[PDB]
Design a protein around this ligand. Sequence first.
Ligand SMILES: Cc1ccc(S(=O)(=O)O)cc1
Ligand SMILES: Cc1ccc(S(=O)(=O)O)cc1
Lengths: 45, 45
Amino acid sequence: KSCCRSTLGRNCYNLCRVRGAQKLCANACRCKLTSGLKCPSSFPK
Amino acid sequence: KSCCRSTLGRNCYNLCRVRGAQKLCANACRCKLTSGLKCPSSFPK
Ligand SMILES: Cc1ccc(S(=O)(=O)O)cc1
Ligand SMILES: Cc1ccc(S(=O)(=O)O)cc1
């Protein structure tokens, strides 16, 4: 599951993932990857 | 040429670009593409 800081970070991640892998795009867009079922509140998007 | 707003934006763009195209990564990372050789001072990174 990806968890991003803001809507800007979410649109970064989703566009990046068109060609890019999860870990690569999480680091580019400052999102968090988690195996949890919900995101922490600091990374809600 | 790619022109980014910040160091974080440049990092974003460079990572995205490992597998993504220029236009897509510029949109994701909020950078601008220019045909010229000078970046707008608003997009200096
Ligand atoms: C392009 C972009 C802008 C801002 C962020 S954020 O500050 O991590 O939400 C991530 C990605
Ligand atoms: C991750 C990240 C944070 C912030 C930006 S920027 O606001 O476009 O400089 C781009 C990318």
